[PDB]
Amino acid sequence: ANPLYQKHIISINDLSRDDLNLVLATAAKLKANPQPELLKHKVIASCFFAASTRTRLSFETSMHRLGASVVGFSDSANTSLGKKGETLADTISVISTYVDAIVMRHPQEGAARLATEFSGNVPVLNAGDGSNQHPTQTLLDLFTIQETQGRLDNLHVAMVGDLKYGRTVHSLTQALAKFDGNRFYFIAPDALAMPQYILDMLDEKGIAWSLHSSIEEVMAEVDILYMTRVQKERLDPSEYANVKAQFVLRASDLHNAKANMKVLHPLPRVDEIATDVDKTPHAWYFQQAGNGIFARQALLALVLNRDLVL
Amino acid sequence: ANPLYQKHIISINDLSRDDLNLVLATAAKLKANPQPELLKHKVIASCFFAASTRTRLSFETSMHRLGASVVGFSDSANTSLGKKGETLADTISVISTYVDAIVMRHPQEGAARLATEFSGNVPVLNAGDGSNQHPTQTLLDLFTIQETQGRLDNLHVAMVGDLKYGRTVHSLTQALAKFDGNRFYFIAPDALAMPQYILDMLDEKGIAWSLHSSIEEVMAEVDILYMTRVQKERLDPSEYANVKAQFVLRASDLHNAKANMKVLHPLPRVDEIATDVDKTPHAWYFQQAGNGIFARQALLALVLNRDLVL
Amino acid sequence: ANPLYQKHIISINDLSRDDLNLVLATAAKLKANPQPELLKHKVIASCFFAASTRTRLSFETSMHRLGASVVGFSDSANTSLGKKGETLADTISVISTYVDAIVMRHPQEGAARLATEFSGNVPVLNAGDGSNQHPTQTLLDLFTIQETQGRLDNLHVAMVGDLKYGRTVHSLTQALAKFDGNRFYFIAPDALAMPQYILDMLDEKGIAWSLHSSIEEVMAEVDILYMTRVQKERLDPSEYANVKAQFVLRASDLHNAKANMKVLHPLPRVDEIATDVDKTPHAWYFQQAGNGIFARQALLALVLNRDLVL
Amino acid sequence: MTHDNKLQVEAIKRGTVIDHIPAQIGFKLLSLFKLTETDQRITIGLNLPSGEMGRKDLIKIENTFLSEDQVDQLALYAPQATVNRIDNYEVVGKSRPSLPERIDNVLVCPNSNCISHAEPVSSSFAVRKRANDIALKCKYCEKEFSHNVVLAN
Amino acid sequence: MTHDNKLQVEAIKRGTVIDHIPAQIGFKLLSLFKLTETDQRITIGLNLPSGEMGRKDLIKIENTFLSEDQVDQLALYAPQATVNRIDNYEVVGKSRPSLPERIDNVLVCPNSNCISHAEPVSSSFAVRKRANDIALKCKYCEKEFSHNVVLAN
Ligand SMILES: O=C(O)C[C@H](NC(=O)CP(=O)(O)O)C(=O)O
Ligand SMILES: O=C(O)C[C@H](NC(=O)CP(=O)(O)O)C(=O)O
Ligand SMILES: O=C(O)C[C@H](NC(=O)CP(=O)(O)O)C(=O)O
Ligand SMILES: [Zn+2]
Ligand SMILES: [Zn+2]
């Protein structure tokens, strides 16, 4: 069987470069020749306890694009958990008895963890658990970074926006820190700063990272500019000074931009990026979005198929 | 054609032991060798006017697990009924013109009845209509009772919880009362007591039944312990003294338990059962949950296929 | 000085027969010989943290009847306690520095007492603290009973309705227990019976009370039929079973009643007293409401005036 | 005139010595009195025996002396408990807790709608013996509860 | 086997002996791993000066036997103390609280949006040698915190 077979993809901390590399490979493979019937007969649950456009929709297309059938929900408000005071665990307890895999997004952290405790044999895929992880996001990210840069080692990577609450940057910093010679520049409001525990990891790994007070000076030496919206919904009222984006990026800012540099964004964006950028070629967030199919597919493929995909 | 072909499954009062027995049989059959394509080309509507996790999800998996395609809704709030003042009947009137069968859950009683008046040829499956019926629930129940006891006649069956408002126990009491030598013990708050009309049926049938004031003394002579959550949402403000569960069951209570005895619960449970039970082997409600596939499948199969399933 | 000069009238349990008799006697004198300017130059605070029609207004009229000036609030919502978040302790602490006495009605029990601990030498008067004490009620009541019966001993008094949350009858019962040979019949729904500690005094004082499941058991017995309102605002959800009048008085149930008998009611009444009673010469609720003026002046006079001579 | 019978004693030179403490109330005491803060060596006999009193908790506090009110609320917790004052290795003082009149600052009025919760004041109940239990009347709400219930705060 | 100055039968045939507990730490431990929720003859010595340790708390249970895991857990509050496996009155083994892998049930994740609160599951942190202290990583939320800021049940 393949390494990720019947495995729970919960946090990026539990994956290896080999793991990462494998999904990628398989993504690039399926992107070339699709396997429309690879997962027929399978039924996957799309459980969203939290809001999503991209993550939920891209995942469901993936499942259909592989002959799999889909059941689940976009809102817990109509679940017995929603209206009958059920517990998430019991929820997962019954659901594990129906389907072959569980994709879930949830407002609190370690929610996916929790679920594996009751999921049984049925593998659990975290579509985002609070401020914590967002692994499937990372995978499309990496796929995109590699698409446009040719490598995942030795990059100049600038992460702007909300990093304290950005599950997106939580995972992905962990992910390229598994690669070598990666320069991390961090531009964040002092309260939406990056959490200690991610920096330490960087320290011990000897990976270099340096705070910055503006996009202006990182802008000449960066391959990747990962922009993030301020996680407004997870904000504490004592942080509501920071609800408006400190760092907005317009086309003007990109003159000095390396010709190879791309702008990335988990999406969605509110004002941290101006539509003029949309015209320019460093802009890659919509292509970035399109890549989620492939990664999610690859992943699905691997987790559900023992024998390494043809 | 098979007996239940093109038939509306609305209330258990309209089924016979032969009927029951047939679904069962077919459940046990499909559970052994599945028919992934048995219902392809068919489209079934999943209409939930009411909340559900188990019932809705298990049904939809069933349909997919038989090659059927599914359309419908989890909330009426977005239906034209929901926002344009449409009538349920007209609702059913249009929907009958699109699909092959209709699964519906609804906040009021005889709602499924109503629908058959407009459904036309298209058979209607009640996923719960108020305090009234819950037939598909009963079917998985029976399947489970038989699974674990070997029979449906001559059982000691204890129904605890809300029975006044428990559509779950409404149907199922009616169902084993179609069987012989069934001992019914009823443990309920005096206001959430079991309705007269179910007892009379029992009287005339000569089936025996006896109220009890505690689990404690029924506990030694019972094969099945059917626990139920207090139907809090259907409660009248003059019954809100009874919103908290009177009878909680913990592992401690099961020493005297017959070695064969199982605990059953329609789900969900809030505090009427304590998680310690979850460890013990009389606990069967999560296995009970898993059985809903088979029954729902069997049913779907029968209602939609003239020729008795291979 | 008089025994009441400068005293806090918080609980009936803190006054004696002679204290009571004193007030009824002044009440009596003032009702015939008015003192237009008795409390002239005095400034009193009318602080209602809870709704009142009779108590607040009657009090304020009494004040003006005595030439005192009034100042206060009908509601806590626009106080700095209501919006800025001031403690009641601080609240009584500054108001006590302004005015000559404090009339207080409060939704929580004991609010009355705590004020005295902050009002300094400024007397505080309980217009009602939760379902604890309604002392001023008992006074106009005593007065009213006296006026109709000509005594306050060896009476046959019925106490119907919410007795558990009825602050008016908590206070009225300790007051009549100070007199001789009174006979108490308590008619109230179990959820709302006379609190134990109250009966504990009765028993422990050698007084004869008795509980009755109806009004008509005592109708030709009792001298005073004290009706009370269900305190739905203080009700517990579990007690919501009982929000409707269980014993309602009709002008026909009075048919066998003693001719000297009078129907009292602290007011307001919802449906526990039929409007047809209003006409009957037993109906006495509205007259007693009137006597609030006299008992209340009476009170005001004794506290703010060292030596009254009428 | 010296040490006890069973074989685990360490008599202090001066200090209080609470004995006869009913089972598993020896640790409650230790906490609900803040005698773990001090420096003075403390000796704690948990689940000690008795034969006739069964298991007993005993507290030996060296050089500390129980407040004359602190023993008054201990009157409630361990009524069967005894307190030995000790000076120069000897039981110089002998007291026993009788039920005080009213107790304050420690109990919580079980009546939710009691002002005492919301407002900043010190509790206070009146301690009157019924027949089978002490009843406590909250000084504010004037409700009376049995010491068993007011002992849940 | 306690040495000189007066008497102390704080020594049994069977049981465990938590020697050398840093002062004040004694009380905590008793609650945290709930070592008093037994019925065996416990004896606790608070702040009793010794020598090596100016003032060392100290606990011993009769007939009770610490687990290699249960033991280790003490390495967070008293890693420099000594367990003694007392059997037939003589020391069979002298152990020390060594830092453990992770600390399941008795530690509440300080993260409010942690799922470990709502749902019925046992708490759990991985333990780590940060710099001048231990770091605690919630099993669920994946947030790690000082062993000084995390609180426990
Ligand atoms: O919230 C964001 O801004 C980033 C991120 N968003 C995405 O996954 C895209 P979507 O919410 O449509 O699935 C997430 O963490 O939710
Ligand atoms: O309500 C219940 O407790 C029992 C019963 N529940 C079930 O059918 C499970 P669910 O609501 O997830 O479909 C029902 O009558 O709704
Ligand atoms: O509320 C009642 O039913 C009885 C009593 N009512 C009165 O005092 C009359 P009012 O609320 O107008 O002052 C009370 O204790 O508030
Ligand atoms: Zn109180
Ligand atoms: Zn956590």
For residue E51, the domain's CATH number is 3.30.70.140
Distance CA B187, CA B159 (A): 6
Strands C124-129 and C101-106: parallel
HSE (side-chain half, CA atoms, 13 Å) at C122: 23
Q: How far apart are the CA of B48 and the centre of ligand 2, in A?
A: 12
Q: How many C-beta atoms surround the C-beta of residue D7 within 10 A? A: 10
Q: Are D85 and D94 in contact (CB under 8 A)?
A: yes
Phi, psi values for residue A8, rounded to 5°: -80, 125
Long-range contacts of B72-77 (CB under 8 A, 24+ apart): B72/B44, B72/B45, B72/B46, B72/B47, B72/B48, B72/B103, B73/B46, B73/B47, B73/B48, B74/A73, B74/A75, B74/A78, B74/B46, B74/B48, B75/A77, B75/A78, B75/B48, B76/B48, B76/B49
User: Quick check: bond before D120 cis, omega within 30?
Assistant: no
Question: Active-site positions of A?
Answer: 54-55, 84, 105, 134
Q: Which residues in chain A are classed under CATH 3.40.50.1370? A: 1-133+292-310, 134-291
Contact B157, B224 (CB under 8 A): yes
Which chain B residue has the Cα nearest residue C243?
B238
Contact A133, A171 (CB under 8 A): yes
Tokens 């399947």 belong to residue: B143
Order of strands across the sheet that contains B69-73: B69-73, B43-48, B101-106, B124-129
How are beta strands C156-160 and C224-227 bridged, if at all?
parallel
- The pair of structure tokens assigned to B210 is 């006896």
Closest residue of C to B240, CA-based? Answer: C238
Q: Which chains touch B (3 or more CB pairs under 8 A)?
A: A, C
Q: Give the Cα separation of D113 and D123 in Å (integer).
A: 14
Residues 6+ apart with CB under 8 A from E34: none
If asked whether residues E86 and E111 sit together in one domain, one would say no
- Is C105 one of the catalytic residues? yes
Q: What does the block give as tokens for C38?
A: 């008795």
Kindly tell me the burial class for residue E34, based on how many C-beta atoms sit within 10 Å of its own C-beta (0-12, 13-18, 19 or more): exposed
Question: In this structure, is residue D115 part of a structural domain?
Answer: yes
Q: D36, E24: Cβ pair inside 8 Å?
A: yes
- How many other β-carbons are positioned within 10 Å of the β-carbon of residue C30? 24
**How far from C250 is each of A305, C211, C220, C244, C281, CA to CA, in Å?**
80, 21, 15, 15, 13
Count of C-beta atoms within a 10 Å radius of residue D114: 25
CA angle in degrees (0–180, nearest 5) for B48-B50-B55: 65
* Catalytic residue, candidates C134, C156, C164, C265: C134
Which spans in chain A are helix H? 17-32, 54-64, 80-84, 88-96, 111-119, 135-149, 167-176, 196-205, 275-279, 285-304
Contact A151, A24 (CB under 8 A): no
Q: What distance in Å separates the CA atoms of residue D59 and residue D135, rounded to the nearest whole number?
A: 28
The kind and range of the H/E element at B197 are: helix B196-205
Residue A275: burial class (beta carbons within 10 Å; 0-12, 13-18, 19+) = exposed
Q: For chain D, how many residues are written?
A: 153
Which H or E run contains B286? helix B285-304
Residue E3 within a domain: no
What method did the depositors use to determine the structure?
A: X-ray
CA distance A258 to chain E (A): 36
Resolution in A: 2.8
* H-run or E-run covering A71: strand A69-73
Residue E27 lies in a domain: yes
How many residues in chain C? 310
Domain A134-291 top-level CATH class = alpha beta
Contact D44, D59 (CB under 8 A): yes
Burial of E103 (0-12, 13-18, 19+ CB in 10 A): buried
Relative to beta strand A101-106, strand D42-48 is unpaired
Residue B161 φ/ψ region, left for φ over 0, alpha for ψ in the -120 to 50 degree band, beta for the rest = left
CA distance A89 to E121: 9
Chain B contacts of A97, Cβ < 8 Å? 286, 289-290, 293
Ligand 2 pocket (Cβ < 6 Å) reads A 80; B 52-56, 128, 134, 137, 167-168, 229, 266-268
Nearest to A68 by CA among A91, A93, A50, A43: A43
Which residue spans within chain B are E strands per DSSP? 43-48, 69-73, 101-106, 124-129, 156-160, 183-187, 209-211, 224-227, 262-264
Residue D138 Cα, ligand 4 centroid: separation in angstroms? 4
Helical H runs in chain C?
17-32, 54-65, 88-95, 111-116, 135-149, 167-176, 196-203, 285-304
Active site residue B183: no
Contact E119 A107 (CB under 8 A): no
User: Which helix (H) or strand (E) covers residue E71, if one does?
Assistant: helix E68-72
Asked whether residue D1 is assigned to any structural domain, the reply reads: no
Q: Do chains C and B touch (3 or more CB pairs under 8 A)?
A: yes
Token pair recorded at residue D99: 């039920």
Residue C200, chain D, CB below 8 Å: the answer is: yes
Q: Is C137 annotated as a binding residue?
A: yes
Among D112, D113, D116, most C C-beta atoms within 10 A, so best to mutate, is D113
- In angstroms, the CA A51 to CA A37 distance is 29
Residues A191, A219 contacting (CB under 8 angstroms): no
Hey, which residues does A186 pair with through a beta bridge? A159, A211
Q: How far is Cα A199 from Cα A184, in angstroms, rounded to an integer? A: 10
Residue D74, judged by CB atoms within 10 A of its CB (0-12, 13-18, 19+), counts as: buried
- Please give the helix or strand (H or E) that residue C85 lies within, else none: none
Max CA separation in chain C (angstroms): 58
The single residue of C7, C26, C42, C55 carrying the catalytic annotation is C55
Establish if D2 belongs to a structural domain: no
| Beta-carbon separation of D113 and C109 below 8 A | yes
* Partner-chain contact B61 A86, CB within 8 Å: no
Residue A115 burial (C-beta neighbours within 10 Å; 0-12, 13-18, 19+): buried
Taking alpha carbons only, the member of C159, B189, E119, B111 closest to residue A91 is: E119
**B8, B42, B55, B183: the active-site residue:** B55
- Distance from Cα C167 to the centre of ligand 3, integer Å: 9
Tell me, yes or no, whether chains C and E touch by having 3 or more C-beta pairs under 8 A: no
Residue D46, domain member (yes or no): yes
- Centroid of chain to Cα E6: 29
Reference C224, options C139, C308, C285; nearest CA is C285
Residue with the nearest Cα to atom 9 of ligand 1? Answer: A54
Cβ-count burial of C259 within 10 angstroms (0-12 exposed, 13-18 middle, 19+ buried)? exposed
Kindly state whether residues E127 and E61 are assigned to the same domain.
no
Is residue A161 within 8 Å of A188, Cβ to Cβ? yes
Q: What residues have CB less than 8 Å from C199, skipping those under 6 apart?
A: C209
Residue among D60, D76, D53 nearest D125 (CA) = D76
DSSP state, residue E99 = P
Query: Quick one: chain E helix, strand, coil %, rounded to 5?
Result: 15, 35, 50
Rounded to the nearest 5°, which phi and psi values hold at E130? -60, -90
Cβ-Cβ contacts under 8 Å, A87 against chain B = 268
Q: How far apart are CA A173 and CA A12, in angstroms?
A: 10
Q: Is C218 in the pocket of ligand 3 (CB under 6 A)?
A: no
Task: Look at B237 and C239 and tell me if their CB atoms are within 8 Å.
Answer: no
Please indicate whether chains B and D are in contact, defined as at least 3 beta carbon pairs under 8 Å.
no
Is E105 found in the same domain as E80?
no
Evaluate: CB of C189 within 6 angstroms of ligand 3.
Answer: no
Breaks (C-N over 2.5 A) in chain B follow: none
At B29, phi and psi to the nearest 5?
-70, -55
DSSP 8-state assignment for residue C273: B
Ligand with the closest atom to the CA of A132:
1
Tell me the residues of B at the C interface, defined by beta carbons under 8 Å apart. Answer: 237-241, 243
Residue D9 phi, psi dihedral angles, 5° rounding: -125, 150
CA distances for C217 relative to C162, C214, C254, C255, angstroms = 18, 6, 12, 13
Shared domain check, E29 and E93: yes
Ligand-binding annotation for C151, yes or no, is no
Residue with tokens 């407040």: D67
Query: What span, in angstroms and rounded, lies between the C-alpha atoms of A293 and A303?
Result: 15
Helix ranges, B33-97 (H): 54-64, 80-84, 88-96
Q: CA-CA distances (angstroms) from residue C277 to C246, C271, E135?
A: 17, 12, 77
- Is B105 one of the catalytic residues? yes
With CB atoms and an 8 Å threshold, state whether B238 touches C240.
Answer: yes
Three-point CA angle C119, C124, C125, nearest 5°: 165
Tokens matching residue B174? 């009616």
CA dihedral C57, C58, C64, C70 (to 10 degrees): -40
Q: Which helix (H) or strand (E) holds B287?
A: helix B285-304
* CA separation for the pair B66, A43 (Å, rounded): 11
C121, burial (CB in 10 Å: exposed 0-12, middle 13-18, buried 19+): exposed
CA–CA separation, D145 and D138 (whole Å): 8
Compute the distance between CA of residue E18 and CA of residue E71 in angstroms, rounded to an integer: 10
Instruction: Indicate the helix (H) or strand (E) that contains B279.
Output: helix B275-279
What the block records as the tokens of D97 is: 């807790």
Tokens of B113: 């009845």
- Ligand 3 pocket mutation, candidates C46, C55, C132, criterion most atoms within 8 A of CB: C55
| E118 and E62 belong to one structural domain | no
Statement to judge: residues D42 and D13 lie in one domain: yes
Q: How far is CA B69 from the centre of its chain?
A: 23
**Cα–Cα distance, A303 to A298 (Å, whole number):** 9
**E35 touches D40 (CB < 8 A):** no
Question: Any idea which residue has 């995109």 for tokens?
Answer: A144
Contact state of A99 with B61 under an 8 Å Cβ cutoff: yes
Q: Tokens 């602050």 map to which residue?
A: C167
Ligand 3 pocket member C55 (CB < 6 A): yes
Nearest-CA neighbor of E61 among E23, E32, E34?
E34
Closest atom of ligand 1 to CA, residue A51? 11
Whether the CA torsion A83, A89, A92, A93 is positive or negative: it is negative
Q: Which of A100, A141, A81, A88 lies closest to A6 in space, CA to CA? A: A100
Listed in sequence order, the DSSP H helices in B110-166 are 111-119, 135-149
Cα distance from C182 to chain D (closest Cα, Å)?
A: 24
Contact E139/E122 with Cβ under 8 angstroms? no
Mutate to test the pocket of ligand 3, among C46, C52, C192 (most ligand atoms within 8 A of CB): C52
Q: Does residue D109 have a known ligand-binding role?
A: yes
E1 lies in a domain? no
Three state DSSP letters for C132-200: CCCHHHHHHHHHHHHHHHCCCCCCEEEEECCCCCCHHHHHHHHHHCCCCCCEEEEECCHHHCCCHHHHH
Provide the 10 A C-beta neighbour count for residue B220.
12
- CATH number, domain A1-133+292-310: 3.40.50.1370
Q: Which two tokens stand for residue A248?
A: 């907005």
CA angle (B303 as vertex; B300, B307 as ends), nearest 5: 110
E strand or H helix at E118, and its extent?
A: helix E115-118
Q: Report residue B74 CA to chain centroid gap.
A: 18
CA of A110 to the centre of ligand 3 (A): 53
**Residue C162 structure tokens:** 């919410």
| Long-range Cβ contact pairs of D48-55 (< 8 A, separation 24 or more) | D48/D6, D48/D8, D48/E41, D49/D6, D49/E41, D53/D20, D53/D80, D54/D23, D55/D23, D55/E39
Of D35, D31, D59, D37, the residue nearest D46 (C-alpha): D59
Q: For residue B207, give both structure tokens.
A: 């089936």
Contact A184, A208 (CB under 8 A): yes
Separation of C84 CA from ligand 3 center, angstroms?
28
Number of structural domains chain D divides into:
2
- Render D119-131 in DSSP notation, one character per residue: TT---EEEEEE-S
Do B104 and B127 contact (CB within 8 A), yes or no?
Answer: yes
Query: Distance between CA A189 and CA A212 in Å, rounded?
Result: 10
CB contact under 8 Å between E40 and D47, yes or no, is yes
Asked whether the beta carbons of residue D41 and residue E39 sit closer than 8 angstroms, the reply is: no
Q: Which two tokens stand for residue D74?
A: 């201990």
Q: What distance in Å separates the CA atoms of residue D138 and residue D144, rounded to the nearest whole number?
A: 6
Structural contact between residues B149 and B24, judged by C-beta atoms closer than 8 angstroms: no
> Within its chain, how far is the Cα of C119 from the centroid?
22
* Number of neighbours of residue A173 by Cβ within 10 angstroms: 27
The finding on whether A53 has its CB within 6 A of some atom of ligand 1 is yes
For residue C77, the 8-state DSSP code is G
Which domain range does residue E143 map to? 101-153
CB-based contact C267:C54 (threshold 8 Å): yes
Burial (CB < 10 A; 0-12, 13-18, 19+), residue E66, is buried
Query: What 3-state DSSP class applies to E137?
Result: strand
> Contact E16/E42 with Cβ under 8 angstroms?
no
CA count, 13 A, side-chain hemisphere, B104:
30
**Checking DSSP bridges between strand B262-264 and strand C69-73, what pairing results, if any?**
unpaired
Cβ of D54: how many Cβ atoms within 10 Å?
11
CA-to-CA distance for C229 and C257, rounded, in angstroms?
22
Is A250 in contact with A257 (CB distance < 8 Å)?
Answer: no
Cα–Cα dist C239/C237, whole Å: 5
| SS3 (DSSP) at D69 | coil
Tell me, in angstroms, the distance from the centre of ligand 5 to residue C55's CA.
Answer: 55
Same domain, residue pair E20 and E48? yes
A89: closest chain E residue by CA: E119
Q: How far apart are CA A107 and CA A124, in angstroms?
A: 16
Cβ neighbours of residue E122 closer than 8 Å, sequence gap 6 or more = E104, E105
Tokens found for residue D136: 């406590």
Coil, helix or strand at residue A51: coil
D3 within a domain of the structure (yes/no): no
